[PDB]
């Protein structure tokens, strides 16, 4: 009687991979604008 | 005079054996049985020669 107790396995299938990360939200939060100098100075 | 042999196997064997190894699980058992019977017969003939 040959069954699954005889037929061994090589490798499992990964099926899927997951990488939990923070949803990165700041673009809509700050008034982003690039600076082209080591020092920035805003006008009030 | 006759001679005979049985395969005895599961469905799950065949499914996994195919998924893992690429082998069939019906064909191998078939192969072994047919082969072993003819091998045992061939042995019988030479045995009778040495016997007699």
Q: What are phi and psi of B19, to 5 degrees?
A: -65, -40
Residues of B in contact with A2 (CB under 8 A): 8-10, 13, 25, 29
Nearest to A4 among B8, B13, B29 (CB): B13
CB atoms within 10 A of CB B16: 18
Separation in Å, CA A12 to CA A17, B8, B12, B16:
13, 27, 16, 12
Query: Resolution of the deposited coordinates, in angstroms?
Result: 3.4
Strand partners, B9: A2
Q: Is B23 helix (H, G, I), strand (E, B) or coil?
A: coil
Solved with: cryo-EM
Could you please report the per-residue DSSP string of A29-40? TS-----SSS--
Look at chain B and count its residues.
52
Please name which of B15, B2, B6, B9 lies closest in space to residue B41, comparing C-alpha atoms.
B2
- The dihedral sign for the CA sequence A26, A27, A30, A33: positive
């Amino acid at each position: 009687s040959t069954t699954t107790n005889s037929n061994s396995i090589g490798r499992p299938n990964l099926v899927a991979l997951t990488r939990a990360t923070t949803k990165l939200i700041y673009s809509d939060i700050v008034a982003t604008q690039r600076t082209n100098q080591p020092v920035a100075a805003f006008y009030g | 005079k006759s001679r005979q042999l049985k395969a005895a196997y599961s469905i799950e064997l065949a499914q996994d054996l195919r998924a893992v190894h690429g082998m069939d699980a019906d064909a191998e058992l078939s192969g072994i049985l047919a082969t072993e019977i003819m091998l045992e017969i061939n042995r019988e003939v030479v045995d009778w020669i040495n016997y007699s």
